[PDB]
Write a protein that holds these residues in place. Structure first.
Motif, PDB file in Angstrom:
ATOM      1  N   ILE A   8     -16.653  -0.606   2.676  1.00 34.08           N
ATOM      2  CA  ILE A   8     -16.005   0.145   1.603  1.00 34.08           C
ATOM      3  C   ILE A   8     -15.370  -0.848   0.629  1.00 34.08           C
ATOM      4  O   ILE A   8     -14.699  -1.779   1.065  1.00 34.08           O
ATOM      5  CB  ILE A   8     -14.904   1.056   2.183  1.00 34.08           C
ATOM      6  CG1 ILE A   8     -15.533   2.182   3.001  1.00 34.08           C
ATOM      7  CG2 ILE A   8     -14.008   1.632   1.080  1.00 34.08           C
ATOM      8  CD1 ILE A   8     -14.520   3.087   3.671  1.00 34.08           C
ATOM      9  N   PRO A   9     -15.511  -0.609  -0.689  1.00 28.09           N
ATOM     10  CA  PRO A   9     -16.112   0.553  -1.369  1.00 28.09           C
ATOM     11  C   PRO A   9     -17.623   0.540  -1.589  1.00 28.09           C
ATOM     12  O   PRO A   9     -18.167   1.522  -2.113  1.00 28.09           O
ATOM     13  CB  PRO A   9     -15.416   0.546  -2.742  1.00 28.09           C
ATOM     14  CG  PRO A   9     -14.358  -0.555  -2.661  1.00 28.09           C
ATOM     15  CD  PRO A   9     -14.885  -1.510  -1.664  1.00 28.09           C
TER      16      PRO A   9
ATOM     17  N   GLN B 293     -11.230   5.664  -5.517  1.00 29.02           N
ATOM     18  CA  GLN B 293      -9.902   5.551  -4.891  1.00 29.02           C
ATOM     19  C   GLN B 293      -9.735   4.278  -4.058  1.00 29.02           C
ATOM     20  O   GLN B 293      -8.639   3.728  -3.961  1.00 29.02           O
ATOM     21  CB  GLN B 293      -9.640   6.768  -4.005  1.00 29.02           C
ATOM     22  CG  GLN B 293     -10.771   7.027  -3.034  1.00 29.02           C
ATOM     23  CD  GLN B 293     -10.712   8.380  -2.368  1.00 29.02           C
ATOM     24  OE1 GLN B 293     -11.747   9.014  -2.136  1.00 29.02           O
ATOM     25  NE2 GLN B 293      -9.507   8.828  -2.040  1.00 29.02           N
ATOM     26  N   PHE B 294     -10.824   3.797  -3.479  1.00 31.25           N
ATOM     27  CA  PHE B 294     -10.749   2.627  -2.613  1.00 31.25           C
ATOM     28  C   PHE B 294     -10.631   1.324  -3.391  1.00 31.25           C
ATOM     29  O   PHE B 294     -10.062   0.347  -2.893  1.00 31.25           O
ATOM     30  CB  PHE B 294     -11.934   2.598  -1.665  1.00 31.25           C
ATOM     31  CG  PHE B 294     -11.957   3.749  -0.713  1.00 31.25           C
ATOM     32  CD1 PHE B 294     -11.179   3.722   0.437  1.00 31.25           C
ATOM     33  CD2 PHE B 294     -12.751   4.861  -0.963  1.00 31.25           C
ATOM     34  CE1 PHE B 294     -11.179   4.795   1.325  1.00 31.25           C
ATOM     35  CE2 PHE B 294     -12.755   5.937  -0.079  1.00 31.25           C
ATOM     36  CZ  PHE B 294     -11.983   5.901   1.068  1.00 31.25           C
ATOM     37  N   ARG B 295     -11.129   1.317  -4.625  1.00 28.05           N
ATOM     38  CA  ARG B 295     -10.993   0.146  -5.482  1.00 28.05           C
ATOM     39  C   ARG B 295      -9.541  -0.215  -5.749  1.00 28.05           C
ATOM     40  O   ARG B 295      -9.205  -1.389  -5.802  1.00 28.05           O
ATOM     41  CB  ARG B 295     -11.751   0.319  -6.804  1.00 28.05           C
ATOM     42  CG  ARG B 295     -13.258   0.253  -6.612  1.00 28.05           C
ATOM     43  CD  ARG B 295     -14.020   0.453  -7.896  1.00 28.05           C
ATOM     44  NE  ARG B 295     -13.759  -0.584  -8.898  1.00 28.05           N
ATOM     45  CZ  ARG B 295     -14.413  -1.740  -9.000  1.00 28.05           C
ATOM     46  NH1 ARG B 295     -15.363  -2.069  -8.139  1.00 28.05           N
ATOM     47  NH2 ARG B 295     -14.093  -2.574  -9.969  1.00 28.05           N
ATOM     48  N   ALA B 296      -8.686   0.793  -5.923  1.00 31.20           N
ATOM     49  CA  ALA B 296      -7.292   0.545  -6.246  1.00 31.20           C
ATOM     50  C   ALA B 296      -6.612  -0.172  -5.094  1.00 31.20           C
ATOM     51  O   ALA B 296      -5.810  -1.080  -5.307  1.00 31.20           O
ATOM     52  CB  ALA B 296      -6.581   1.858  -6.554  1.00 31.20           C
TER      53      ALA B 296
ATOM     54  N   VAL C  47      -4.870  -6.297  -2.841  1.00 33.36           N
ATOM     55  CA  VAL C  47      -4.982  -7.502  -2.013  1.00 33.36           C
ATOM     56  C   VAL C  47      -5.796  -8.627  -2.630  1.00 33.36           C
ATOM     57  O   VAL C  47      -5.588  -9.787  -2.279  1.00 33.36           O
ATOM     58  CB  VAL C  47      -5.448  -7.202  -0.556  1.00 33.36           C
ATOM     59  CG1 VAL C  47      -4.381  -6.414   0.166  1.00 33.36           C
ATOM     60  CG2 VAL C  47      -6.761  -6.465  -0.533  1.00 33.36           C
ATOM     61  N   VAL C  48      -6.719  -8.316  -3.537  1.00 33.28           N
ATOM     62  CA  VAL C  48      -7.473  -9.393  -4.193  1.00 33.28           C
ATOM     63  C   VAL C  48      -7.475  -9.343  -5.721  1.00 33.28           C
ATOM     64  O   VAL C  48      -8.122 -10.177  -6.371  1.00 33.28           O
ATOM     65  CB  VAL C  48      -8.932  -9.528  -3.654  1.00 33.28           C
ATOM     66  CG1 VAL C  48      -8.925  -9.823  -2.145  1.00 33.28           C
ATOM     67  CG2 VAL C  48      -9.749  -8.285  -3.989  1.00 33.28           C
TER      68      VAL C  48
ATOM     69  N   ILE D   4      -1.775  -4.870   4.417  1.00 33.46           N
ATOM     70  CA  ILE D   4      -1.674  -4.082   3.187  1.00 33.46           C
ATOM     71  C   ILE D   4      -2.782  -3.013   3.120  1.00 33.46           C
ATOM     72  O   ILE D   4      -2.499  -1.843   2.839  1.00 33.46           O
ATOM     73  CB  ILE D   4      -1.614  -4.984   1.932  1.00 33.46           C
ATOM     74  CG1 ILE D   4      -0.338  -5.845   1.950  1.00 33.46           C
ATOM     75  CG2 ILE D   4      -1.732  -4.152   0.649  1.00 33.46           C
ATOM     76  CD1 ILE D   4       0.982  -5.084   1.951  1.00 33.46           C
ATOM     77  N   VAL D   5      -4.013  -3.396   3.438  1.00 31.34           N
ATOM     78  CA  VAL D   5      -5.110  -2.431   3.502  1.00 31.34           C
ATOM     79  C   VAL D   5      -4.846  -1.387   4.587  1.00 31.34           C
ATOM     80  O   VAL D   5      -4.944  -0.185   4.335  1.00 31.34           O
ATOM     81  CB  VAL D   5      -6.460  -3.121   3.752  1.00 31.34           C
ATOM     82  CG1 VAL D   5      -7.567  -2.080   3.972  1.00 31.34           C
ATOM     83  CG2 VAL D   5      -6.810  -4.009   2.568  1.00 31.34           C
TER      84      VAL D   5
END
Ligand code: HEM
Ligand SMILES: CC1(C)[C@@H]2CC[C@@]1(C)C(=O)C2
Ligand SMILES: [K+]
Length: 404
Positions: free
Chosen positions: A89-90, A100-103, A108-109, A212-213
């Motif tokens: 993912i993503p 939503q997963f991109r945010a 973190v990167v 964080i993830v």
């Protein structure tokens, strides 16, 4: 070679092998660029690696990456078994779900973390290079290309450096398999590593990227442990097998071109522009999509379930996109490329990548302005999802160097 499917006309067959291309000894980008010779159609079928389409031109590559309705990321790797196992993912998701997963990955990167890490990144580059400087030689892939990006990723992810050989092994099996592991076996081994760590960091949240993830939210709801694992695996692959390879292509080029070294030494403010032109010329990624339905694309009949390789590497090497595409010109007016992808899956790590590249060029050229490929060495490339350099022996006169 896989038997030609009845729907693919014999005239569109070009048996290109993405994991061992025929012209590899000429250089990997050169090897891929055979698909762009005048006698080759815009869209070909290879019977290699189970059979798949290859878009050979930037116009088609861009068009297909934009059109997620017809070209789905659900199965983005060749061979089919790899693509089917692929659930990171993503990247394995299409919009709307993917977004939503991109945010969360950006937490973190993304740029904010790049700004946080810039000090340590600069510090490590300077440290590694100063140690090599008085030696007059190095094995660049082992001595710099690997440790500089990887040690920073491990720091960011809160993972011990002692784990590097294991993780680097697994990530390399997913991009340039040696045959010992299927993609699915390598992915599951990566997940096996991550599962206990993710549980630990959901119980006791910390500051590292996995924490964080694992404790993050996506469009206002909690991420699941499964989703966290699938995102963390992707970050590990990105951290361990992208810039690591690109740095070696760039340094190989600079070692072979005194005039380009001179340009950046004389005018260091050109380094960001140089980074961009190197990203075009030594572009290195090639993944793809799966057809969601029967679709006619540029006169070619594609069948639902057909895999299509859409080599990000190829767009910027296309003569229709960039005049004299194999020539490196730091002053190139319009540097056209899809090195970091195209469409809704545009690389999330690009800001980190550019920083690592620019820091390397700056700090290397400051200390070791003049260097060459070791006498008699022949540089061997390797090809796959992410292409690379097997070894890069460099030499220089320490009397031409400067300690900062
Ligand atoms: C020179 C360095 C890099 C290159 C050339 C590169 C290339 C790419 C490309 C072509 C894609 C799109 C793949 C697709 O559409 O299927 C991508 C996506 C991605 N990259 Fe990078 N990458 C680099 C560095 C990194 C780094 C260091 C990270 C850190 C983990 C990273 C993280 C990601 C992530 C998370 C995605 C998925 C975005 C999405 O699917 O929405 N990349 N990268
Ligand atoms: C194609 C990629 C470079 C992008 C980030 C890591 C990688 C291998 C992926 O699986 C998505
Ligand atoms: K899949």
């Amino acid at each position: 070679l896989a038997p030609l499917p009845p729907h693919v006309p014999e005239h569109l067959v070009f048996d290109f092998d993405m994991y061992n291309p025929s012209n590899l000894s000429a250089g990997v980008q050169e090897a891929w660029a055979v698909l762009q010779e005048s006698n080759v159609p815009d869209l070909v079928w290879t019977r290699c690696n189970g059979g798949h389409w290859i878009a050979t031109r930037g116009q088609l590559i861009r068009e297909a990456y934009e059109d997620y309705r017809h070209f789905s990321s659900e199965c983005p790797f060749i061979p089919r078994e790899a693509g089917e196992a692929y659930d990171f993912i993503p990247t394995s998701m299409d919009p709307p779900e993917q977004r939503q997963f991109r945010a969360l990955a950006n937490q973190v990167v993304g740029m904010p973390v790049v700004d946080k890490l810039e000090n340590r990144i600069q510090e490590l580059a300077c440290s590694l290079i100063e140690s090599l400087r008085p030696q007059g030689q190095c094995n660049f892939t082992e001595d710099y290309a690997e440790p500089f990006p990887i040690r920073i990723f491990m720091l960011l992810a809160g993972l011990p450096e002692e784990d590097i050989p294991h993780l680097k092994y697994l990530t390399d099996q997913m991009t340039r398999p040696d045959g010992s592991m299927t993609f699915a076996e390598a992915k599951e081994a990566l997940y096996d590593y991550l599962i206990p760590i993710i549980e630990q960091r959901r119980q006791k949240p910390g500051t590292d990227a996995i924490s964080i993830v694992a404790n993050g939210q996506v469009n206002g709801r909690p991420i699941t442990s499964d989703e966290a694992k699938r995102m963390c695996g992707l970050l590990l692959v990105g951290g361990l097998d992208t810039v690591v390879n690109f740095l070696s292509f760039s340094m190989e080029f600079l070692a072979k071109s005194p005039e380009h070294r001179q340009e950046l030494i004389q005018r260091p403010e050109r380094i960001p522009a140089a980074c961009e032109e190197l990203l075009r010329r030594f572009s290195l990624v090639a993944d793809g999509r799966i057809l969601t339905s029967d679709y006619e694309f540029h006169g070619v009949q594609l069948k639902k379930g057909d895999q299509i390789l859409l080599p990000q590497m190829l767009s910027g090497l296309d003569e229709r996109e960039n005049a004299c595409p194999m020539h490196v010109d730091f002053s190139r007016q319009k540097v056209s490329h899809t090195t970091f992808g195209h469409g809704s899956h545009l690389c999330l790590g690009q800001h980190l990548a550019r920083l690592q590249i620019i820091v390397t060029l700056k700090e290397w050229l400051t200390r070791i302005p003049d260097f060459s490929i070791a006498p008699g060495a022949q540089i061997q490339h390797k090809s796959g999802i992410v292409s690379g350099v097997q070894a890069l022996p460099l030499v220089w006169d320490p009397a031409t160097t400067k300690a900062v």
